[PDB]
Amino acid sequence: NIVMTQSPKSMSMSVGERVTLSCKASEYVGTYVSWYQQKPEQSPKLLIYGASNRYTGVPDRFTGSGSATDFTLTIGSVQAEDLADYHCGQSYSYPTFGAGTKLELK
Amino acid sequence: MTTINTHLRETLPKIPYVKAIDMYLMGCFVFVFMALLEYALVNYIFFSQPARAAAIDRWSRIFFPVVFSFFNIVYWLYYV
Amino acid sequence: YGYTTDDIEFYWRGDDNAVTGVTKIELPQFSIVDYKLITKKVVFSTGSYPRLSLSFKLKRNIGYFILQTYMPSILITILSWVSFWINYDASAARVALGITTVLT
Amino acid sequence: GDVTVILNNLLEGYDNKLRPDIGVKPTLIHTDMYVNSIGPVNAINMEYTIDIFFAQTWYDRRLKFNSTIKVLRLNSNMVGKIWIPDTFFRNSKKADAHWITTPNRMLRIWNDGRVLYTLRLTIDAECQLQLHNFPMDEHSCPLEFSSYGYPREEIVYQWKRSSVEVGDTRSWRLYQFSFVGLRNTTEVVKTTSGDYVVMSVYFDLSRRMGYFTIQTYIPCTLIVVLSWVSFWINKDAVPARTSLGITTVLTMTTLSTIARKSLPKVSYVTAMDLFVSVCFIFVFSALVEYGTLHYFVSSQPARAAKMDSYARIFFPTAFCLFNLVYWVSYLYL
Amino acid sequence: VVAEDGSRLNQYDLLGQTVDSGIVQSSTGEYVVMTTHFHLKRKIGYFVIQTYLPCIMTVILSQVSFWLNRESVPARTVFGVTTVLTMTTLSISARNSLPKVAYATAMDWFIAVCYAFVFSALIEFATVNYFTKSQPARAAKIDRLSRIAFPLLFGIFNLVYWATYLNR
Amino acid sequence: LSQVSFWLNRESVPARTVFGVTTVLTMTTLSISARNSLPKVAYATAMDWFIAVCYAFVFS
Numbered sequence: 051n052i053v054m055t056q057s058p059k060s061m062s063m064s065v066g067e068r069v070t071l072s073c074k075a076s077e078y079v080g081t082y083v084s085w086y087q088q089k090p091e092q093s094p095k096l097l098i099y100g101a102s103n104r105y106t107g108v109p110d111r112f113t114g115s116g117s118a119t120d121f122t123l124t125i126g127s128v129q130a131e132d133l134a135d136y137h138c139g140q141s142y143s144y145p146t147f148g149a150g151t152k153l154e155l156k
Numbered sequence: 157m158t159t160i161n162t163h164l165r166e167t168l169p170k171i172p173y174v175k176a177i178d179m180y181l182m183g184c185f186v187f188v189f190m191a192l193l194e195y196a197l198v199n200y201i202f203f204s205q206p207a208r209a210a211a212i213d214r215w216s217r218i219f220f221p222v223v224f225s226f227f228n229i230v231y232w233l234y235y236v
Numbered sequence: 237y238g239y240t241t242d243d244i245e246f247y248w249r250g251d252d253n254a255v256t257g258v259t260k261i262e263l264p265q266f267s268i269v270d271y272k273l274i275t276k277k278v279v280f281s282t283g284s285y286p287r288l289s290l291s292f293k294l295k296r297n298i299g300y301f302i303l304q305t306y307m308p309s310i311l312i313t314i315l316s317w318v319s320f321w322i323n324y325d326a327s328a329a330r331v332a333l334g335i336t337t338v339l340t
Numbered sequence: 341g342d343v344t345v346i347l348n349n350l351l352e353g354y355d356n357k358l359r360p361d362i363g364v365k366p367t368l369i370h371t372d373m374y375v376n377s378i379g380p381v382n383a384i385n386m387e388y389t390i391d392i393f394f395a396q397t398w399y400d401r402r403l404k405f406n407s408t409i410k411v412l413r414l415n416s417n418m419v420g421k422i423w424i425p426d427t428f429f430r431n432s433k434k435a436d437a438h439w440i441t442t443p444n445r446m447l448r449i450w451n452d453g454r455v456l457y458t459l460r461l462t463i464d465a466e467c468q469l470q471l472h473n474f475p476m477d478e479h480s481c482p483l484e485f486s487s488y489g490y491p492r493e494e495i496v497y498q499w500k501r502s503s504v505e506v507g508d509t510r511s512w513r514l515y516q517f518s519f520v521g522l523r524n525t526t527e528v529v530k531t532t533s534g535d536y537v538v539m540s541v542y543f544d545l546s547r548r549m550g551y552f553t554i555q556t557y558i559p560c561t562l563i564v565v566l567s568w569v570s571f572w573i574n575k576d577a578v579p580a581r582t583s584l585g586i587t588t589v590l591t592m593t594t595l596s597t598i599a600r601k602s603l604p605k606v607s608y609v610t611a612m613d614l615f616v617s618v619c620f621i622f623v624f625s626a627l628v629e630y631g632t633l634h635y636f637v638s639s640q641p642a643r644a645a646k647m648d649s650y651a652r653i654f655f656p657t658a659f660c661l662f663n664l665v666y667w668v669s670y671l672y673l
Numbered sequence: 674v675v676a677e678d679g680s681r682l683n684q685y686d687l688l689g690q691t692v693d694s695g696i697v698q699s700s701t702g703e704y705v706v707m708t709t710h711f712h713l714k715r716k717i718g719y720f721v722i723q724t725y726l727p728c729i730m731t732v733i734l735s736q737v738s739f740w741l742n743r744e745s746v747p748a749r750t751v752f753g754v755t756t757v758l759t760m761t762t763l764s765i766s767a768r769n770s771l772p773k774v775a776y777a778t779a780m781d782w783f784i785a786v787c788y789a790f791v792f793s794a795l796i797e798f799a800t801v802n803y804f805t806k807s808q809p810a811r812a813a814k815i816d817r818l819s820r821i822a823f824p825l826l827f828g829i830f831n832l833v834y835w836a837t838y839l840n841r
Numbered sequence: 842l843s844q845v846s847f848w849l850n851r852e853s854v855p856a857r858t859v860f861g862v863t864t865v866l867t868m869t870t871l872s873i874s875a876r877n878s879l880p881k882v883a884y885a886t887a888m889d890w891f892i893a894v895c896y897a898f899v900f901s
């Protein structure tokens with residue numbers, strides 16, 4: 051089992067500032083790391099597939115960066131419709147997900 | 157002995173473990189080295205006490221062939 | 237191969253300029269002295285067939301062999317001679333010299 | 341669906357035995373080269389290996405179509421059905437395309453009839469290495485290609501602005517040499533068939549003197565200093581200065597044999613074997629000096645006494661001077 | 674997937690595999706590339722047996738010369754000369770097996786240090802012979818000091834070298 | 842060469858020892874060299890017998 055550690059657990063930030071979410075892999079997972087956005091009472095929505103490949107319909111402000119074991123999701127000009135849980139999941143092996151990051155407005 | 161080994165190894169693959177021929181050549185090399193070291197030991201005590209030097213030479217004459225024969229018998233019964 | 241001499245004829249176009257590029261060839265060990273172009277007919281059990289022969293005369297360069305193998309022999313022979321200037325009393329020295337020269 | 345119709349219309353009534361513009365004007369071909377790697381450079385055979393992607397583009401007004409499709413992107417299936425230039429490499433000992441899993445070939449035809457044709461090639465290119473100053477030798481040797489049967493009146497090649505592109509150079513197989521740059525050239529050569537446009541790419545390679553240093557130079561100088569050691573031994577008829585000398589000589593000749601076997605059998609004198617010969621002269625000089633000293637022991641003791649120290653001082657100074665002269669002359673060339 | 678019995682490696686060991694997927698830019702466009710990495714680990718037994726043990730034996734043989742009496746000059750001269758020739762032959766042979774890389778490997782450093790030890794033993798014998806019959810006490814002192822110094826330094830070097838190239 | 846050592850004086854031990862050892866070494870080198878030309882057959886050829894007898898004479 052590959053356990054993925056997501057940090058920070060929760061971070062409250064203001065509009066229009068660069069916010070970066072980090073994911074750490076227990077073992078090697080080449081670039082099969084995905085980032086999903088889950089709004090309250092909504093199913094997860096795929097944002098980044100592979101490492102640094104925006105999914106169709108994802109605004110160009112969502113940027114993914116990856117490595118063999120260290121990955122980051124970078125949001126640029128943040129907006130107010132980005133308040134959602136963000137999960138990172140690996141797919142190199144049988145899929146596992148991180149705890150997630152609860153974005154907050156402040 | 158080193159020449160024999162070098163000529164032999166130029167016709168085999170680079171293998172990690174020790175082959176039986178390698179074991180035999182190493183044992184023979186150890187025997188030759190022990191003969192040289194025995195001579196050096198004799199020369200170290202030549203002047204101070206030639207009696208024990210002569211005793212050591214006699215003991216070597218007696219016990220190098222015997223140990224070599226024992227090693228050969230062990231080697232040729234281990235594999236064959 | 238198949239066509240006998242009454243079916244096909246071979247000849248050099250130019251008869252002396254048919255072959256070019258010989259003088260530009262450099263060989264590490266040989267020098268092209270010259271080359272000839274020959275026209276002839278050869279007889280086999282199945283008939284007589286046209287033949288063209290191109291031949292090169294190659295002369296071997298000597299300097300490389302001089303350096304690699306000749307000098308050492310003269311030098312070892314001289315080092316063996318050196319034994320005569322050693323006094324007969326030094327048996328080990330002279331015998332070592334001679335044996336080592338033979339081994340070399 | 342309708343790409344099949346376009347392809348069928350293109351090939352109907354098409355003769356691939358005739359170059360485009362057969363009796364009008366020469367076919368102009370623009371060539372590009374991507375160099376994946378420059379392989380080992382073995383001086384024994386005076387050749388080097390190179391792996392490239394070779395792109396060729398030309399205009400064929402017969403391959404002209406009108407549709408919403410602007411470019412036809414095809415695999416190697418259709419390569420053999422159209423006219424292809426017969427480009428060959430003139431200084432290649434041998435070369436081969438790649439065929440796994442399918443022929444590594446690409447064909448693209450544009451709306452206006454422009455054709456792009458790319459294939460992957462590995463080439464063993466001949467170049468004659470002048471091994472003077474070896475191992476301090478630098479070479480820039482070519483890769484030439486032209487049409488085999490089409491003279492200048494029929495096919496003309498032309499380098500693009502960014503024609504030759506190299507990769508990283510960190511993953512290449514150059515051990516003795518380092519890649520320092522390249523350049524392209526064009527010219528016309530005369531042959532029994534006619535005048536041919538010949539294109540050339542020159543790769544600049546400089547040998548790096550790190551392997552040969554530790555392989556030949558250090559052992560030879562170490563043997564020389566070992567020969568020097570004799571001058572301090574007890575001065576008598578001892579075999580400690582005779583066996584020493586002769587063993588030094590045999591080791592020197594063995595080292596010379598190996599070192600010369602390193603490289604091809606060239607009749608001229610290289611920089612390396614001049615050094616070996618000088619180190620071979622120094623050891624002989626030491627041995628003969630000892631011989632003369634021993635001979636003079638019986639005649640004059642003071643002569644030998646002062647001769648020992650004179651050699652002890654004259655040898656290292658001469659060797660250092662020779663080293664300085666040799667390295668200054670060869671490095672600044 | 675690698676077959677269980679499908680190993681034709683004799684000098685290496687296959688630790689595992691690793692795949693990846695990526696994109697490469699090219700002058701003709703943008704292409705997908707699928708990558709696999711096979712992680713290999715060289716086995717050391719052959720090089721031990723064929724280079725390291727010969728060098729250690731040669732160094733030991735060179736150091737044996739310190740126990741010969743100062744009167745047997747040709748004996749020690751032969752020891753030194755033959756040990757140096759052996760070290761040179763070993764250096765050539767051990768460099769033969771490798772690609773002609775332009776840098777120095779760990780084996781190269783080990784061979785160079787062993788070569789230095791043999792040469793230093795020869796130099797020590799030369800110094801002893803130089804100071805023999807003129808300052809015998811000094812020659813005896815340096816000889817009996819070398820008898821302990823050389824093995825100790827060689828052992829320390831071997832320990833350091835192996836600890837630094839194996840704990841990695 | 843090995844038999845030439847007989848004519849040396851008995852008061853020269855190093856010289857005759859060198860003769861014997863170097864002759865034996867040369868015989869060993871020759872024996873190693875000779876087979877290198879032939880395939881690795883499992884029996885002894887005439888050349889093998891000749892080399893064996895020469896080695897026996899040197900050793901004797």
Ligand SMILES: *[C@@H]1O[C@H](CO)[C@@H](O[C@@H]2O[C@H](CO)[C@@H](O[C@@H]3O[C@H](CO[C@H]4O[C@H](CO[C@H]5O[C@H](CO)[C@@H](O)[C@H](O)[C@@H]5O[C@H]5O[C@H](CO)[C@@H](O)[C@H](O)[C@@H]5O)[C@@H](O)[C@H](O[C@H]5O[C@H](CO)[C@@H](O)[C@H](O)[C@@H]5O)[C@@H]4O)[C@@H](O)[C@H](O[C@H]4O[C@H](CO)[C@@H](O)[C@H](O)[C@@H]4O[C@H]4O[C@H](CO)[C@@H](O)[C@H](O)[C@@H]4O[C@H]4O[C@H](CO)[C@@H](O)[C@H](O)[C@@H]4O)[C@@H]3O)[C@H](O)[C@H]2NC(C)=O)[C@H](O)[C@H]1NC(C)=O
Nearest residue numbers: 416417418419420421435436437438439440441442443445
């Ligand atoms: C003296 O005798 C010698 C021995 O007989 C002789 O050498 C032989 O020369 C002939 C003629 O040149 C060679 O035959 C040609 O081979 C070309 C490929 O060359 C490379 O590959 C072969 C092996 O070929 C296999 O693999 C390729 C691709 O992988 C296939 O395309 C082949 O059909 C063949 O596939 C079979 O075998 C595979 C196993 O290998 C199987 O997996 C597979 O399923 C098949 O069963 C190598 O041997 C070559 O190496 C040799 O040659 C090189 C030359 O540089 C040397 O360096 C090297 O050292 C070796 O000597 C080389 O690596 C073929 O491309 C070629 O066939 C095409 O051309 C002819 C003529 O134009 C067409 O009729 C033919 O149909 C092919 O054209 C179609 O395919 C091409 C593909 O690009 C299309 O572009 C083209 O448009 C056309 O498409 C049409 O047909 C397709 C079906 O074919 C269809 O799919 C399309 O949709 C479309 O309809 C030809 O067969 C032969 O290999 C040599 N043999 C040897 C041992 O060297 C020598 O010349 C003689 N000397 C003299 C002076 O006479």
Ligand SMILES: *[C@@H]1O[C@H](CO)[C@@H](O[C@@H]2O[C@H](CO)[C@@H](O[C@@H]3O[C@H](CO[C@H]4O[C@H](CO)[C@@H](O)[C@H](O)[C@@H]4O)[C@@H](O)[C@H](O[C@H]4O[C@H](CO)[C@@H](O)[C@H](O)[C@@H]4O)[C@@H]3O)[C@H](O)[C@H]2NC(C)=O)[C@H](O)[C@H]1NC(C)=O
Nearest residue numbers: 269270271272273274275276287288289290291292293294
């Ligand atoms: C390398 O090795 C090859 C192979 O051995 C040599 O090839 C020989 O080359 C020489 C010189 O080129 C050839 O000599 C020539 O032979 C011709 C054939 O003679 C036969 O036929 C004529 C009538 O057709 C008869 O008179 C004769 O008896 C033979 O039966 C001659 O025609 C040549 O000229 C001779 O005749 C004319 C006219 O009379 C005279 O003016 C000439 O001076 C000369 O006498 C000539 O003799 C020889 O045949 C070749 N041998 C083979 C087997 O082909 C190469 O020479 C050699 N060297 C090089 C550098 O390649």
Ligand SMILES: CCCCCCCCCCCCCCCCCC(=O)OC[C@@H](COP(=O)(O)OC[C@@H](N)C(=O)O)OC(=O)CCCCCCCCCCCCCCC
Nearest residue numbers: 785788789790792793796797800811815818819822823826
């Ligand atoms: C490819 C590269 C090849 C390059 C080859 C070049 C290699 C260079 C390497 C060259 C160095 C050569 C090594 C040593 C040779 C002779 C030393 C020697 O003995 O002569 C000095 C003498 C003067 O002092 P004294 O006589 O004691 O005076 C008495 C009283 N007044 C007092 O001082 O108490 O005695 C000493 O000092 C003894 C200590 C040295 C020997 C033991 C350790 C050295 C080896 C241990 C160290 C050797 C290790 C080798 C290197 C790691």
Ligand SMILES: *[C@@H]1O[C@H](CO)[C@@H](O[C@@H]2O[C@H](CO)[C@@H](O)[C@H](O)[C@H]2NC(C)=O)[C@H](O)[C@H]1NC(C)=O
Nearest residue numbers: 498499500501502503504521522523524525526
């Ligand atoms: C490769 O060949 C091309 C075409 O001959 C060269 O392009 C010329 O480069 C020079 C600069 O050296 C310019 O002044 C010309 O205007 C270029 N001509 C064209 C048609 O682009 C190019 O220099 C060559 N590459 C080299 C020499 O490295």
Ligand SMILES: Cc1ccccc1-n1c(C)nc2ccccc2c1=O
Nearest residue numbers: 157158161178181182185722727730
């Ligand atoms: C003789 C032998 C057999 C198998 C493996 C190694 C060796 N071996 C040894 C044990 N010692 C040497 C000392 C110097 C030069 C070469 C060797 C050598 O080849």
